[PDB]
Amino acid sequence: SRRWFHPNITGVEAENLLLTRGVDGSFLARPSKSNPGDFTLSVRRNGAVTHIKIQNTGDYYDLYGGEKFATLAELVQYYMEHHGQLKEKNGDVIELKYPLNCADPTSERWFHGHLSGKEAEKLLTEKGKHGSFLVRESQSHPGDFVLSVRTGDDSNDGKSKVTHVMIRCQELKYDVGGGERFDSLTDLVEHYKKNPMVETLGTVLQLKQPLNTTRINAAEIESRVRELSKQGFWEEFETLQQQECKLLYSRKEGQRQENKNKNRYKNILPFDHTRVVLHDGDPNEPVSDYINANIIMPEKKSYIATQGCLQNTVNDFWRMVFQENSRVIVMTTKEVERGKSKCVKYWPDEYALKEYGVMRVRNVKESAAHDYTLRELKLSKVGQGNTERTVWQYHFRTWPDHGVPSDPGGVLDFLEEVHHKQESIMDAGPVVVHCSAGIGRTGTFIVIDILIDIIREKGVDCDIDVPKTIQMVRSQRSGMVQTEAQYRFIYMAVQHYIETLQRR
Ligand SMILES: Cc1nc2c(-c3cccc(Cl)c3Cl)c[nH]c2cc1CN1CCNCC1
Predict the structure, then answer these.
(1) Which stretch is the leader sequence?
(2) How far is Cα 342 from Cα 340, in angstroms, rounded to an integer?
């Protein structure tokens, strides 16, 4: 759960909450509603409140006087399980002990406040399934709410139905007319999710899934983008973010002492269940199986999402490319940005040959395009001539230092080319995609590519679901797609791709 995040709170409301309803060690996180990608962690300690800034420009959450994290949930998990670690500017330890829980329902998938009764009925009737539900504000009784639920089989023949349950708001708590009174709609829904309501004649009002309203027909993207552009994008994104607490999968291998220095950022780590395991390592190397990389399998083409190489991981990077039979690499950072190293140069200069441990790489030819450079590399294993394969490195060079491109056309041209190269090579393995930490630009590029592939096969007349696709990729590497700016950009790129298919 993720109740310590408060989407709609001011700095002063945050202090007031912590001072009046928290104790020393209580904490909450919140957005800045001006500056997007700015967050604040507010912590009570010694009877006063501290505000700690968290910045995300697209690559990671950067806690001031702390570490870099792939999600806020991973950030909170880390500090709640590691005392003495978060520190004030002038030295002192800041303890995160007691989450201060938020009552606001606006980020719950099931909350559709504005929805009217008939609007709710049609949605559940057309889009919904057995156990699909939503909660809406009452029209007849202001301040109250309505739970609307579809139940039945899986044509319109009476096999299914919608029932409406009134939720009263009484002196600040919520109820369904009897029993327990709840501090929040979330507590109410969670309770009736585990303990379903039974109608008098024995229909069970099972709350199985929130109604899906994000699945759209690709042809109607422009219409969804229009609707979301009225800040709805913030809403839909934060709803996705609320579900990141479901994705706290183990990352034990990356936490091994032997693997610590193989990670660019010590707490941005590959999930165990999807990490790329390297075989045939040096038998004098106690741990030679680890690289900070995960397989991303869409639910024909798969990806490896990885970090920019460190000087001490370049040999492992090439062992991975060879082992997985990858024939295309996508790089989405310059080697250096804002004077800081984002990815060491792991390839030879044009026309040169270098050995990287047991792997040999020749840079055959570099071709410069407007937004990218293409390097044609030849990769082989030392001592084995017949292992040579060409690996095409697509190096995107014009991504802005912070935030996202103001137009998706360069990225889409680039991905179209990457896609065709990959499709031209029989039995090519996964496409390697990396930036700096390998979660923000990397996740943005992979998600766009997945979505555009669907359309590419099926056409404008098919279903896409942007946040569902992102949740699926985020179950395979932590924090894939970092910011609301990237989220918006994914929609703008799909929109742009669709319009260019209508113009042809
Ligand atoms: C229904 C819904 N679903 C989503 C998802 C979503 C989709 C598929 C899988 C997963 Cl795990 C997720 Cl989170 C991300 N944003 C969403 C927004 C909504 C609707 N809004 C309406 C306004 N009030 C907040 C809800």
Answers:
(1) none
(2) 6
Domains of the chain: 11-99 (3.30.505.10), 117-212 (3.30.505.10), 218-309+319-340+402-503 (3.90.190.10)
- Please report where in the chains the tokens 């690559």 appear, as a residue: 59
Within 10 angstroms of residue 150's Cβ, the number of other Cβ atoms is 25
Contacts of 257 (CB under 8 A, 6+ apart): none
For ligand 1, pick from 107, 109, 127 the residue to mutate: most ligand atoms within 8 Å of CB.
109
In 423-462, the DSSP E strands lie at 431-434
Residue 17 in contact with residue 26, Cβ under 8 Å? no
- CA torsion 350-354-357-361 (nearest 10°) is 50
How determined? X-ray
Tokens matching residue 143: 């301040």
Contact at 8 Å (CB) between 359 and 382?
Answer: yes
Maximal CA-CA distance, the chain: 80
The answer on whether 339 is annotated among ligand-binding residues is: no
Distance separating alpha carbons of residues 369 and 391, to the nearest angstrom? 18
Instruction: Please state, in angstroms and rounded to a whole number, the distance separating the CA atoms of residues 50 and 102.
Output: 18
Pocket of ligand 1 (CB under 6 A): 106, 109, 111-112, 210, 212-214, 235-236, 239-240, 243, 467-468, 471
